[PDB]
Design a protein around this nucleic acid. Sequence first.
RNA 1: UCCGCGCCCCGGAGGACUGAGGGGGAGACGGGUUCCGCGGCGCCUGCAUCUGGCCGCGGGUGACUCGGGCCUAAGCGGCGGGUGAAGACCGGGAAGGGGCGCCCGCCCGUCGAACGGGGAGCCGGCGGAGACUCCGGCAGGCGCGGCCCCCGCGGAGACGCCCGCCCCCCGGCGACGCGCACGGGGACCGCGGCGGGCGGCGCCCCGGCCCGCGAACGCCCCGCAGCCCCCGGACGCCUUGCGCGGAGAGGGGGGCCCGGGGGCGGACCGCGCGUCCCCGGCCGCCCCUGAAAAGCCGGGGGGCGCCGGCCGCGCGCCGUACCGACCGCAGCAGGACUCCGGGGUCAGCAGCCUCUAGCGCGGGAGCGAACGCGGCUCAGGGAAGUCGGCAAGCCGGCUCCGUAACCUCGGGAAAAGGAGUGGCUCUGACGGCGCCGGGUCAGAACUGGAACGGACGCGGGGAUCCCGACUGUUUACUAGAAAC
RNA 2: GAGGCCCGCCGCGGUGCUGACGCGCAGAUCGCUCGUCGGAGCCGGGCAUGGGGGCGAAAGACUCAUCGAACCGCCUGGUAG
Lengths: 50, 90, 49, 95, 72, 248
Amino acid sequence: TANKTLSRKLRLAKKTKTNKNIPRWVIAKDHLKKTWNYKRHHWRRSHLKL
Amino acid sequence: AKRTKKVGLTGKYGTRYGRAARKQLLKIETSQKAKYTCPFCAKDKVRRTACGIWTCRSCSKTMAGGAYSLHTEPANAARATIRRLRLARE
Amino acid sequence: QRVLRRLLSRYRDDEKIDRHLYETLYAKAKGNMFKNKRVLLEHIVGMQK
Amino acid sequence: ADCRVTCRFHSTYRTRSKIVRYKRTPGNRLTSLRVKKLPNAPHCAETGKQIHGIPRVIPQHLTRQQRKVSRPYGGKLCGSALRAHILESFLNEEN
Amino acid sequence: PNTITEENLMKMIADGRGKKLVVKSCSKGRLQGKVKLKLRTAKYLYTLTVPNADDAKSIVKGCKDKVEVQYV
Amino acid sequence: GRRIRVQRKGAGSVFRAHVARRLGAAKLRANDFAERTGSVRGVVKAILHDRGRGAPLARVQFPNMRGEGRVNELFIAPEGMYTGQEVFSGNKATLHIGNILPVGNIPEGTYVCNVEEKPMDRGCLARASGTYCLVVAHNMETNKTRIRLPSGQKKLISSKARAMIGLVAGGGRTDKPLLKAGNAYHKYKAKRNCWPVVRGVAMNPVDHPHGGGNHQHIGVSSCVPRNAVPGQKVGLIAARRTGCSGGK
RNA sequence: UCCGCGCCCCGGAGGACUGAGGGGGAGACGGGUUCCGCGGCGCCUGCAUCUGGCCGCGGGUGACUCGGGCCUAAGCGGCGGGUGAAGACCGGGAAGGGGCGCCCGCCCGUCGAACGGGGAGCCGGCGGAGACUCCGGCAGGCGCGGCCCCCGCGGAGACGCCCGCCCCCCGGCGACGCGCACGGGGACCGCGGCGGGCGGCGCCCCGGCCCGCGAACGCCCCGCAGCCCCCGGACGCCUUGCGCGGAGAGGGGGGCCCGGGGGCGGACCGCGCGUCCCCGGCCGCCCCUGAAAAGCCGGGGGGCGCCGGCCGCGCGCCGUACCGACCGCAGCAGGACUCCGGGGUCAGCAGCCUCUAGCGCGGGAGCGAACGCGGCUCAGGGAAGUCGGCAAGCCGGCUCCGUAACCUCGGGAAAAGGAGUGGCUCUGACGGCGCCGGGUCAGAACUGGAACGGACGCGGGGAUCCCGACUGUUUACUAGAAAC
RNA sequence: GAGGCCCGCCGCGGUGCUGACGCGCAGAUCGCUCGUCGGAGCCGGGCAUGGGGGCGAAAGACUCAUCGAACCGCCUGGUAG
């Protein structure tokens, strides 16, 4: 892992970037009512690439 | 100072391996570790590097030989034949 | 063995003993004849005389 | 009080290349210094004996005078092997 | 770093060969009462340990005024 | 039934030869013009131990006859080969141990090794430690030479077929008892995965024909026919006779 | 545990524990932001929380020198083709390249190892989070350009010194097993002195503790053993063990290699026993003989024409945080690879305490029932208990005595059995002497509730019979066996 | 200073208590006790061998908690007096 490949580092990077909650303004714009990303992951429970 | 009366270098194997095997090995392993006379430098320095391979410590000459003796008895008989047969041709 | 050999070599080098005597005393030293340097030194004096 | 140096190398596995010796730095801490495996000096083609004159350094970092011996066949042959070849060449010509 | 082979080498380098600065450190810690002139050529730092401070002054004059001289 | 161990062994995989760190294939010098009309001369550079072979192997350097370099040839070492020995290969090679000559030239009663089964085969006969073939007779009319193979069989070879004079070294290797299972392990590591051997009476009925009952017995004659199929051939193959009896 | 904004937060003070095969500090893999700072407790933290690996926000991984990349290993893919209904599998015999007219040339790999090989990095400092990477100092490697420059010499010899290149060949280096002992370095340790700082002090105390630093690299000088030269011509030289010598000893004088030391440049003083690591010369071992290849470098012949120095300049691509966080549904008395490894007691890397460092685990009180579990002891007897001495208990360290049948003569055997052991006060031995080290082995007094391997660690033994010779191996998760 | 030698540490196995555990710490652990500990040793990485096949110091053992023939999908909503 410390000796990561570039391809692997870039796929893992997107997961950190997309691990974000719905922006509060987007909930107001879309009148979403349900307020949770669901695609969000936690390092201990998630098994990315498994 | 005579540490063992009958078993020689076979005292290494303790009481295991039987009596017949330890008697054969006594003779075989005495020959394997023996210092033989260099056919070239006439010095008793030849020792066995590997099976069939014997090297003179002083002469530095490496010679093909029997596995446990520098010279096998068949081979000495063969040498005598070739020498006589070669002389017969010439 | 090192202590006995050190004394024997110096005596041969200083010519206190001959090299034949040194060889005889060096073989005796290897054979455990001399328990300590004092016994060697005493035997050397006796052999010399 | 606690001279635990840790590991200078990328991996902890201690192979022949990964050996460290410890000294004291000017800042009073124990240090790990890689011990490079000394290259063998050249050996005689006949006799296999370390040729004299050439030090046990990679010949890439040696310089020509230090990686050569001033004799015909200086590096390949030792002065006894070369003398033997000189004698045989002349003697065989006589017969 | 290396030790310059006397003032003859030191000044030959300081006169024509690459030279940047000659730093005169003075008697640090009183281990020695000598003064150390150190020249930074491109390749190495060369140091002349001068037993007498007066001896260093004449050597400093030999160094061209193009070489920067600092005293410490 | 499972494919039996002999069936599995022929599919390569784990039962292949442990050929790593082996010197090379021991063979005679290639038949060439200077070996057909003349004798080439080679010096024994080194007598060395092959990994899987008890017999020592000798590296003999010959001149390149098609170039300016030198050719290194690995041969089985006949007993008496020394570092610096000048061996000769060719039709006119002299009768000395380590010289390779066609067997028609070789007198009868001579002990030879690494004999060629057929002309220019690079040697296929007596190659194991202490083994030797004997020149028995020369048939000049047919240009064929009878030799006594190490098994005591006699074969007619070509007079052209070449042989190296001398017993192959390492003789008496089998006399020393292995003594321990350990020594067998070491020897077999160098050769291939053929050890340890489990008796088929010990195995289950699925694993082996001898299989397993309540009393650990073959249960049918061990003697199997020559036309038995691959799974069936497990006992004594086409035994002309069986039992320990004196004679011959 | 006490006190303090007082939470299991945090700080100070007491008492502990993990105890250098650490509950210590780091890597490989695997996770993939868990890292760090600020705020927060809605969730989770199986009690609580003001805590946090949780939630929100804003950041964080810097390389000519370290690793990838590169080379090859086991292996795998590729190959005019061969074959199979194909999918696809199998594979040298085929007009298979190279700077270059010429000339030379049978024929794969820019696959495969962040543990093998490899051109070269060290110290000091800095940040909230990182460092062989930043910054400062100081080097080394490998190119490229500018400029100057020019192709051998010395010694009796081993070789020395003041550096040519290409092809074609012949080599060398890379490049290598295991072990007992022995020697030499480095670090670690310990004990003195000395200089600086503490603590305790009822009594003593120059007796306790804490610190006293020196890297890579550049020169110079040494360096055991080993190998070699030259004179010369022998039972001598030597190791712990060996070994060695008319195929040339000893002796004398030299050359070379030695992961090393000292001096100087970078820039506290001694002394000893161990430990640990590396290294050296040996010796033992094998039906076991302990990888390869890029890359680099000699030599011979040929052809040709340099080398060097100084001064500039450059070095791309990727990895780089953190891990008590990995994998088992879980922050699961479950596993999981390495690196460094202080002191005392001791044969010990054992056990038992401790320095450094870490730290107080899915919770607290009260009570002192039965019963269970983990222990401790028990009069007299001593296996009468039980299917069977199951379980416990006995024994045990060292020293010296003293040991039977039997045997494959090696064993049995620690057979069986006995005796001693503490502390003090001395006396011998044993090296390197004036000196100056040693820490073992003996011996003697004197003492002590009749005590001593005073904890700890640490065989109970003997006589038989059956079976398998033996060391091994096995039904992962009911059979370790006489089975294999 | 020899040995598939012996005692014994980590390691690697797993004997007995027919101990704890058995709505566990755990879909095989925990505690003592024990076998071994220079060797037919042990461990990591790469690699090969694939399902009637492999691999097996043989126990029908092992092949991702699955084995006297793995798992996944499909035939298949197979058939059943």
